[PDB]
Design a binder for this molecule. Structure first.
Ligand code: ATP
Ligand code: ATP
Ligand code: MG
Lengths: 393, 51, 152, 836, 146, 390
């Protein structure tokens, strides 16, 4: 509560202890004196009747205007609802920490002098982007990464948990992490996990959702997205499928691609530009990364870059037992027989196989899922490969 | 007036010199969702939708 | 709907607030509640994808235009609450209406009733139905060829 | 899986509980060596209790048994060590220190920082528990700490190194291995932790820092520390030891600033220049150099400060009729303040007799002394100008001239004693006003010099018959200010004698409050050394006794921040006017560390919200004292609130306080507030007077003068300045009758604390040499890895810049290398050899 | 130019253009106000605006020729203290394809370089270094040309 | 428990905990209940419960904002347009002198006879006042290394002429007023701009090119015009356009209209810079990764007079940058920073700062508190080699 900063080494030390013991001891003297005074006299009556004088000054028909410019000197220009513009005096009881242009101010009826402010809605965009807890699962449902999860934890979680480590040595955390790899490999899932596990406000956006059909709306959207992230303490932003917005930036192009490039420039400035980004982190994903712009994924914008390989032989077993976890299976399930094949299966492919097998098991009324069903489902899912066989090989 | 009955989104009559809520005028609910229940949807089966 | 940030509103458009409330309500209740929300559309592609997520309305069903049996069935159901004469052969009426749609078979009913009314009677006749279906299908083909000419 | 494999590997030895016990030698060395390799190995991520340490937990008892009493050659040593390593998780007894006390003496670095820190903590605890009787048991501990400290220095861990070598109280050993690369950090921290620490330990820490700052031939910093300690002999050793002449110039400037003097022998090279510098004689030349460079010479008349035309002239005609005597006295004060030390003045110099004759009675006194204020620091021509007003018809004008000579001589030590030469005539004269002017000027003309001739002239008067309580009080003040911190016995003796000489009725007079002030003002800085006096004052009347005791207690522990005295005064508060001095003391004790000052602001806010009227009319002055020339927003708001107050005493005190807090700042916000505030109490004579005085103080000088007692990084506490501040503030405790009455000349007691705010850089030859200097707020860099930047919010100006409170100036370029690392006041520069 | 496109917005500019067209030469003849204009592209202006009644006299401004380049340089360097050795014919010849707004760069940058080298009066080499500055040319890491 | 972070961890934890408890206890013992009506701390209902509010409500009437439109005759007679209220022909109250009022300035008038009492500052789009810097960055010219000629030119064009006008005015040189900074991504453009903003002593404005595209036609030009009017009110100001390629696109109109409004805003900026209306004391900077796309009219002297090329730093600058960024570290004593400079081939400033931070990382993960050489070698490996293919 607006307490003093010790500004000793800030790391466990004897000076941090003595500057700390001192504030505690002063608070102790203050508390003792206050308790003595309260016992000696309640002062409830005196503290009261100040509310009465205030409410006397602010008449009953208080008017909700809209502040529009503070002259910096206990004066203001407050606009009444109709649209008129008055130049009123700011009184002494208004908490000035709450006065910024555009705030719904509470004016006097006969004199329009500012006498209070009101709260506003919390959903410019906060609700629509924040994801809350991930319905899928926690870190439990993710297996096989181990190293990647460790990287992300150090990049985004560890700087929140124990700042002392980074602080001790004078190095700030990395700026942003870009998750890149073949489709269906665990990018969005790991971001979801590090979101639902940490203690900041995690915001998610799709790149195609920044392609706007009015000019100068994409840049506005990105500017806002990075505007309500410093209003909210530590924050994380994850711009998924960025490829749809950040591309190689070929100049020989016509149409709305120019607007795409212009929003890309706005983002490129937000991440690392003139001003200090405050306390926010940026995660990104891209199935295809060779096509990003050099200035977006350059070192000071995205320090960490993470590859995401497919499950090889055993992570396949882990994922399979993760998705088959909740289903009654017959005692003939030759799971390895399904895994041993070097079919280059992907994680999303494993989920598809599990769901399809479960669904046909439901179709046949059978209380349990059989190995034959899983193999048939595997054949069916892989059926969505196509392409020209001899060609290219 | 006991404030418990001054719900949000309710019409009220305010006085002239010093606006003072001093009535709770009625409201029109206008149920728009209670006009489409069909019960069991009689005469609507798989049989007369042959094909 | 069709998106949550479409016109640059910032999620404050009414069309988007209704969708947000619908999403909140759909995520309100559990799968085991015997409350299934059937949703329909005449244009799938435009339809938003935030509805088709896991934990929401995923399963979809295609709908080809109805066949002869389906056409006859739909005509039967839509004419159900009309006065008819005897010996009315709806199968024949369908035969005289190949490659029609639901709205066409809905229009043929009202047209035929109104013609019967001009005849100054309480009942619709098979001859009246034939003439109505001829008119409705002729205007349908006229609309189709007008669209083709506009394309030309 | 990996878990199964690692568990099986750990079991490979865990199952063989006596693997070393088996007679076969193939399991003696290799197994224990492999275990040491595995445990000592590091892991990834945080991994609290790394996998080896976690895995060896259940194998704890057998781990001890295998050691027990086996062969002492190597197996026992290694087993003891590994037990010490795993002796961390259990978190029980001192098995770590016990087993490292008896085990292989392998290099600690092989174990890591974590264990070394834990073993350092255990060693500190054990030494604390260990009685001094077990001297032999301490030699292993001292070996361990001698090994530990270098590991802490080479691994950039100086703060904990000082901490550990403090817990075992051996802070004199730092010298023997400190090395160059890591001495700045250790001295910085060791000082920083020296005000918050109890009494006997603080001196030892300061000795250590001074010893090191010598060891590395860093002399001006050592002088800073020695004065801090307030030891004059160490100051001799520091000054004389140095052979470098320019460095001696620099020490001279610092010393002259402090207002402390050192009397060189006549054989020191260039003696005349050292003495000239240490006299602050040239200070006027530099002041006028700065004033010319900034082009701020033009005199400002009081109206320019008033800017009345801006305010809405609703009563431009027959407005409120305020007192003419009071308005013209205030105008004289503001004219003296605004032009102070610049020499010239549009009002007086052009025609001063008319302005003086606009004033009335005692206003002639303060009005004339305003002229001495105006020529301050200009002894040479000050007397040439003031000569006319010295010889006048009105006694008040003559005494004004006297107080003016006292002001002009102030702060600058001339060998010709014009002040003592002139003010000698009348000190015993009959006219109490003449005596008062003479004595106040003379005390302001030497305060802190501790001149024995002055003392042996002045001391009788407090015992004279023709000495009214005002004269007795003024005399006690003069002695206190001329014997600051000198523990001088004569002043104390005479003060006590006069204090016990007076009947109860006399003690009730407010001018008797000026005896305890003298007594406490003699002894500044010496806490716990006054208990004799506290016994000497136990024989005063109950109210006056409480007043004198409390006052001397607070005047003893100035610049301490002793929390126990804070608590005792607070206990007192929760009655007479004792409590007013208690309130002032709450701030006087805590005028040091920033932590103290802010927490005291909070305590004062609470004391105003809830409190009795006597409390309330003293909080403003303590708020003013706690922040002088430091107009912080919160003090300004919480003071302006009580300015527009029904309680008139509170109003006067708050208005004076807000005038001070802004002393010599030229704040636009504050000037606007005071203009509005004059608008409000336009019909109130006293409040309007306080307002006019505050408008002068805010524009003291023209932003080139600051009363703040502290200087040299807010660390060195000035005695003359604090003396003047106490003199002025205590008077206001009965503001109404003294200041808003016949006694306003006390307002010149601020002259003791007037210094400049310049930064004028000289070369080795004492010539101006402008250099680009970054100017901005300070940053504390205690125990921060590397050499992190030490300024924020910085703007790059040229050399002769004005440093407001908390503004630290650095050099923009490595072109010049300064002598003293405190780029404040006057500094010298030398060329860096390796500039490119 | 106007055109038939389904994209809106441009129509409003076209419409204020129609209004300007009408103001120049239309009903209610105006014979007291005259108009000027300037364009880098005349290939995109509407024929009804280049028409021979609204915008009658059209004037071309060519990239200055050698004599013009010397004249421009001389005009702009008139204030600076230049030495009596600069051959403005040379400086004109080594300034091919230099639009008039370019000596300003050359004249001024020559003064700037004179300041850099702590000079007082300009000399031919100062102007040459100015020219090499204004052209703004990059090297290819090698000079294989003979 | 844990491994044990520090010997005092538990003691500081305890003092913090009881600090929180004593703060909560005083909070309860003092009230201070949050008020939904925006009302100050009761100790700060101060002059507010009374004694200034009651003294400010009496003498300080409500003036009403009005926009003067004309000042006819020498005799004071002013046509003002009160917004959404009415339009009047009023006179001057005594407080304002006739010189203070001009046409087009917002003025305050009373509610009874509508006579003018106070002028007021003009109205500026909220989105055009934030681009002022307000708090200046701390980066300085020692933090930028390996770029010495470039920084010299920038300082001689944007910085030196303002500080010391007489040098240039004597000899008779009007200094260049624009700079185009171009070079590979992450070479030092925006940092040198930050340094210029920190050192300079005049108004500074940051405009992003992507901040001047607007939905409604003819808005961006208004924004630029307002920005230059504002910057021209000040005594001197610097504007630093970033990613100016955002709106400086080349003109290629053909067939169906494409990106034409951006072209109008670009023309408006062109005319503001160098054109009929004199440009006062303003200096402009621009930064682009792609300078070729900028149109032939902007890139011309008179608008962008200088062109500073930023090239990847040489070996000496490489070590210098390494050493600047490795300053506030807890690092070992002897590191052959020349070795580290050699070991990384052509690489930009961002590479090097990433190297420093990755070395700090490899120090942390090894649970060490002082950075050594091996840490930096591991850092260089993990930065250059591993992230080569991007
Ligand atoms: N190792 C894994 N553990 C658990 N689930 C996994 C794993 N790998 C893939 N999945 C499954 O992949 C599904 C797809 O979501 P995911 O977040 O992994 O996509 P993605 O890799 O970001 O895809 P895209 O590249 O298309 O953006 C998740 O529902 C999860 O069930
Ligand atoms: N010469 C340098 N000295 C110190 N740091 C540098 C240097 N060059 C680059 N950097 C680092 O590079 C980081 C990237 O920001 P910088 O301002 O250099 O980018 P930029 O060159 O403007 O890039 P862009 O072309 O993407 O706008 C800066 O934060 C700074 O830390
Ligand atoms: Mg993916």
């Amino acid at each position: 509560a607006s307490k003093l900063p010790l500004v000793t080494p800030h790391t466990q030390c004897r000076l941090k202890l003595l500057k700390l013991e001192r504030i505690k001891d002063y608070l102790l003297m203050e508390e003792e004196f206050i308790r003595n005074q309260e016992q000696m006299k309640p002062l409830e009556e005196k503290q009261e009747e100040e509310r009465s004088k205030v409410d006397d000054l602010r008449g009953t028909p208080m008017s909700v205007g809209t502040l529009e410019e503070i002259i910096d000197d206990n004066h203001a220009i407050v606009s009444t609802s109709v649209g008129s513009e008055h130049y009123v005096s700011i009184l002494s009881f208004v908490d000035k920490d709450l006065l910024e242009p555009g705030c719904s101010v509470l004016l006097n009826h006969k004199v329009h002098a500012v006498i209070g402010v009101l709260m506003d809605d919390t959903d410019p965009l906060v609700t629509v982007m924040k994801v809350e807890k991930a319905p899928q699962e926690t870190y439990a449902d993710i297996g096989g990464l181990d190293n990647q999860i460790q990287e992300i934890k150090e990049s985004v979680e560890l700087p929140l948990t124990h700042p002392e480590y980074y602080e001790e040595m004078g190095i700030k955390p990395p700026k942003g992490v870009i998750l890149y790899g073949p489709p269906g490999t665990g990018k969005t899932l790991l971001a979801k996990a590090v979101a639902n596990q940490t203690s900041a406000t995690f915001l998610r956006v799709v790149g195609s959702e920044l392609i706007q059909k009015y000019l100068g709306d994409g840049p506005k959207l990105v500017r806002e997205l990075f505007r309500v992230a410093e209003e909210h303490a530590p924050s994380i932003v994850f711009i998924d499928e960025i490829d749809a917005i950040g591309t190689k930036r070929y100049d020989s192009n016509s149409g709305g691609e120019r607007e795409i490039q212009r929003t890309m420039l706005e983002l490129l400035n937000q991440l690392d530009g003139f001003d200090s980004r405050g306390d926010v982190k940026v995660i990104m994903a891209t199935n295809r990364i060779e096509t990003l712009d050099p200035a977006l994924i350059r070192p000071g914008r995205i320090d960490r870059k993470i590859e995401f390989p497919l499950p090889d032989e055993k992570t396949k077993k882990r994922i399979f037992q993760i998705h088959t976890s909740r289903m009654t299976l017959a005692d003939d399930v030759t799971l390895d027989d399904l895994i041993m094949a070097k079919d280059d299966l992907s994680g999303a492919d494993i989920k598809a196989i599990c769901t399809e097998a479960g669904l046909m098991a439901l179709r046949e009324r059978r209380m349990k899922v059989t190995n034959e069903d899983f193999k048939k489902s595997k054949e069916n899912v892989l059926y969505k490969k196509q392409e020209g066989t001899p060609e290219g090989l | 007036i006991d404030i418990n009955d001054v719900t949000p989104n309710c019409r009220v009559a305010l006085r002239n010199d010093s606006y003072t809520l001093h009535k709770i005028l009625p409201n029109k609910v206008d149920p728009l969702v209670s006009l489409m229940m069909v019960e069991k949807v009689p005469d609507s089966t798989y049989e007369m939708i042959g094909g | 709907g069709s998106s949550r940030l479409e016109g640059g509103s910032g999620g404050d458009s009414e069309v988007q607030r209704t969708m947000l409330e619908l999403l909140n309500q759909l995520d309100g209740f559990e799968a085991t509640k015997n409350i299934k929300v059937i949703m329909a559309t005449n244009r799938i592609d435009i339809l938003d994808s935030a509805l088709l997520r896991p934990g929401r309305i995923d399963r979809k069903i295609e709908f080809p235009p109805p066949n002869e049996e389906a056409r006859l069935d739909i005509l039967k159901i839509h004419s159900r609450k009309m006065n008819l004469t005897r010996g009315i052969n709806l199968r024949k009426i369908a035969e005289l209406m190949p490659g029609a749609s639901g709205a066409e078979v809905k229009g043929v009913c009202t047209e035929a009733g109104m013609y019967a009314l001009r005849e100054r009677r309480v009942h619709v006749t098979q001859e009246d139905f034939e003439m109505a279906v001829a008119k409705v299908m002729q205007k349908d083909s006229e609309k189709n060829m007008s669209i083709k000419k506009l394309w030309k | 899986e990996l878990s199964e494999e690692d568990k099986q590997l750990q079991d490979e030895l865990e199952m063989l509980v006596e693997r070393l016990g088996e007679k076969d030698t193939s399991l003696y060395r290799p197994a224990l060596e492999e275990l040491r390799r595995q445990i000592r190995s590091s892991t990834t991520s945080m991994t609290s209790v790394p996998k080896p340490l976690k895995f060896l937990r259940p194998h704890y008892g057998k781990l001890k048994e295998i050691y027990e009493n086996m062969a002492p050659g190597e197996n026992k040593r290694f087993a003891a060590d590994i037990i010490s390593v795993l002796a961390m998780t259990m978190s029980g007894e001192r098995e770590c220190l016990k087993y490292r006390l008896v085990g292989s003496q392998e290099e600690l670095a092989s174990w890591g920082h974590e264990y070394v820190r834990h073993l350092a903590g255990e060693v500190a605890k054990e030494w604390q528990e260990l009685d001094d009787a077990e001297k032999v048991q301490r030699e292993p501990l001292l070996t361990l700490v001698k090994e530990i400290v270098p590991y802490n220095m080479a691994h950039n861990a100086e703060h904990e190194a000082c901490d550990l070598l403090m817990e075992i109280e051996q802070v004199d050993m730092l010298e023997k291995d400190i090395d160059e690369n890591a001495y700045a950090k250790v001295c910085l921290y060791l000082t920083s932790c020296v005000n918050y620490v109890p009494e006997p330990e603080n001196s030892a820490l300061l000795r250590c820092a001074l010893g090191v700052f010598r060891k590395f031939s860093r002399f001006p910093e050592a002088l800073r520390l020695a004065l801090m300690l307030n030891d004059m002999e160490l100051v001799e050793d520091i000054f004389t030891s140095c052979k470098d002449v320019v460095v001696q110039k620099q020490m001279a400037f610092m010393l002259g600033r402090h207002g402390v003097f050192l009397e060189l022998s006549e054989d020191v090279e260039e003696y005349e220049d050292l003495t000239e510098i240490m006299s602050n004689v040239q200070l006027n030349s530099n002041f006028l150099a700065l004033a010319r460079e900034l082009d701020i010479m033009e005199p400002k008349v009081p109206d320019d400060i008033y800017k009345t035309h801006l305010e809405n002239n609703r009563f431009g005609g027959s407005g409120s009729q305020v007192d003419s005597a009071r308005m013209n006295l205030a105008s004289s004060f503001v004219n003296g303040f605004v032009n102070a030390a610049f020499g010239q003045d549009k009002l007086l110099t052009d025609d001063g007799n008319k302005w003086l004759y606009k004033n009335k009675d005692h206003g002639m006194l303060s009005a004339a002394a305003s002229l001495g204020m105006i020529l301050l620091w200009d002894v040479d021509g000050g007397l040439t100008q003031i000569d006319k007003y010295l010889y006048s018809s009105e006694d008040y004008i003559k005494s004004g001239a006297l107080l003016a000579c006292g002001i002009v001589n102030s702060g600058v030590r001339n060998e010709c004693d014009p002040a003592l030469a002139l003010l000698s005539d009348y000190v015993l004269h009959n006219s109490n006003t003449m005596r008062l002017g003479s004595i106040f000027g003379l005390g302001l003309a030497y305060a802190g010099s501790n001149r024995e001739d002055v003392l042996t002239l002045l001391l009788p008067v407090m015992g004279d018959s023709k000495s009214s309580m005002e004269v007795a009080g003024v005399t006690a003040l003069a002695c206190g200010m001329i014997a600051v911190g000198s523990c001088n016995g004569d002043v104390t003796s005479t003060i006590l004698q006069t204090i016990m000489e007076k009947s109860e009725t006399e003690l009730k007079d407010t001018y008797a409050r000026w005896l305890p002030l003298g007594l406490g003002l003699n002894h500044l800085g010496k806490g716990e050394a006054i208990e004799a006096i506290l016994a000497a004052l136990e024989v005063v009347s109950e109210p006056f006794r409480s007043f004198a005791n409390t006052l001397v207690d607070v005047c003893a522990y100035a610049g301490s921040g002793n929390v126990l005295k804070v608590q005792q005064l607070l206990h007192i508060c929760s009655m007479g006017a004792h409590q007013g001095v208690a309130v002032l003391g709450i701030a006087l004790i805590a005028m040091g560390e920033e932590i103290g000052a802010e927490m005291a602001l909070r305590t004062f806010g609470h004391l105003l919200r809830y409190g009795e009227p006597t409390l309330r009319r003293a909080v403003p002055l303590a708020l003013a004292l706690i922040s002088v020339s430091n107009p912080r927003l919160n003090i300004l708001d919480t003071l302006s609130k009580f300015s527009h107050d029904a309680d008139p005493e509170v109003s006067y005190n708050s208005i004076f306080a807000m005038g001070m807090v802004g002393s010599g700042t030229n704040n636009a916000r504050l000037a606007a507030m005071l203009r509005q505030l004059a608008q409000y109490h336009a019909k109130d004579p006293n409040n309007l007077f306080m307002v006019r005085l505050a408008q002068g103080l805010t524009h003291l000088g023209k932003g080139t003068l600051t009363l703040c007692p502290y200087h040299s990084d807010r660390q060195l506490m000035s005695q003359v300045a604090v003396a003047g501040l106490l003199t002025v503030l205590v008077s206001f405790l009965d503001v109404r009758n003294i200041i808003l009455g016949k006694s306003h000349y006390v307002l010149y007691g601020l002259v003791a604390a007037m210094q400049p705010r310049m930064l004028v850089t000289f070369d080795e030859e004492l010539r101006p040499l402008p250099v680009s200097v970054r100017v901005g707020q300070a940053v504390d860099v205690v125990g921060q890895a590397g050499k992190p930047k030490t300024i924020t919010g910085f703007q790059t100006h040229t050399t002769p810049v004005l440093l407001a409170h908390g503004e630290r100036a650095e050099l923009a370029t490595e072109e010049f290398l300064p002598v003293t690392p405190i780029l404040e006041g006057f500094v010298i520069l030398r060329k860096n050899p390796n500039y490119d | 130019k106007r055109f038939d496109s389904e994209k809106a917005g441009d129509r409003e500019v076209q419409r204020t253009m129609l209004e300007l067209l009408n103001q120049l030469d239309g009903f209610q003849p105006n014979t007291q106000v005259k108009v000027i204009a300037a364009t880098n592209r005349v290939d995109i202006l509407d024929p009804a605006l280049l028409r021979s009644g609204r915008l009658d006299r059209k004037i071309e401004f060519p990239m200055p020729n050698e004599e013009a380049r010397a004249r421009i340089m001389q005009i702009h360097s008139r204030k600076m203290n230049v030495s009596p050795d600069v051959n403005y014919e040379e400086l004109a010849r080594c300034t091919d394809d230099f639009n008039g707004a370019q000596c300003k760069a050359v004249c001024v940058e020559a003064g700037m370089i004179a300041l850099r080298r702590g000079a007082t009066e300009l000399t031919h080499e100062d102007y040459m270094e100015g020219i090499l500055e204004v052209q703004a040319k990059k090297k290819a890491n090698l000079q294989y040309y003979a | 428990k844990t491994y044990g972070q520090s010997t005092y961890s538990r003691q500081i934890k305890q003092v913090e905990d009881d600090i929180q408890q004593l703060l909560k206890k005083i909070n309860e013992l003092t009230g201070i209940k949050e008020s939904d009506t925006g009302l100050a701390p009761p100790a700060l209902w101060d002059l507010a419960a009374d004694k200034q509010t009651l003294q400010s409500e009496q003498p300080l009437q409500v003036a009403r904002c009005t926009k003067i439109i004309n000042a006819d005759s020498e005799d004071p007679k002013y046509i003002i347009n009160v917004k959404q209220f009415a339009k009047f022909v009023v006179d001057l109250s005594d407080q304002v002198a006739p010189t203070d009022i001009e046409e087009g300035m917002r003025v305050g008038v009373d509610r009874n006879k509508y006579q003018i009492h106070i002028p007021l500052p003009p109205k500026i789009d909220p989105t055009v006042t934030m681009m002022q810097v307000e708090e200046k960055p701390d980066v300085t010219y020692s933090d930028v290394g390996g770029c010495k000629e470039q920084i010299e030119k920038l300082r001689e064009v944007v910085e030196t002429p303002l500080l010391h006008p007489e040098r240039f005015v004597n000899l008779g040189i009007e200094p260049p007023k624009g700079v185009l900074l171009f070079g590979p991504p992450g070479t030092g453009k925006t940092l040198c701009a930050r340094a210029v903003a920190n050192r300079t002593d005049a108004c500074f404005i940051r405009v992003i090119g992507s901040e001047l595209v607007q939905k409604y036609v003819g808005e961006g030009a208004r924004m630029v015009r307002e920005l230059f009017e504002m910057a021209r009110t000040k005594k001197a100001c610097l504007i630093f356009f970033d990613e100016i390629d955002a709106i400086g696109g080349a003109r290629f109109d053909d067939g169906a209209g494409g990106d034409n409004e951006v072209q109008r805003t670009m023309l408006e900026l062109i005319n503001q810079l160098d054109g009929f209306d004199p440009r006062g004391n303003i200096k402009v900077l621009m930064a682009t990764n792609r300078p070729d796309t900028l149109d032939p009219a902007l890139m011309r002297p008179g608008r962008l007079d200088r062109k500073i090329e930023f090239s990847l730093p040489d070996l000496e600058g490489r070590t210098h940058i390494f050493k600047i960024h490795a300053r506030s570290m807890s690092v070992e004593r002897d590191i052959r920073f020349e070795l580290l400079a050699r070991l990384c081939p052509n690489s930009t400033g961002a590479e090097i700062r990433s190297v420093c931070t990755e070395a700090g990382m490899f120090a942390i993960r090894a649970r060490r508190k002082i950075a050594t050489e091996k840490d930096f070698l591991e850092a260089v490996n993990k930065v250059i080699k591993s992230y080569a293919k991007f």
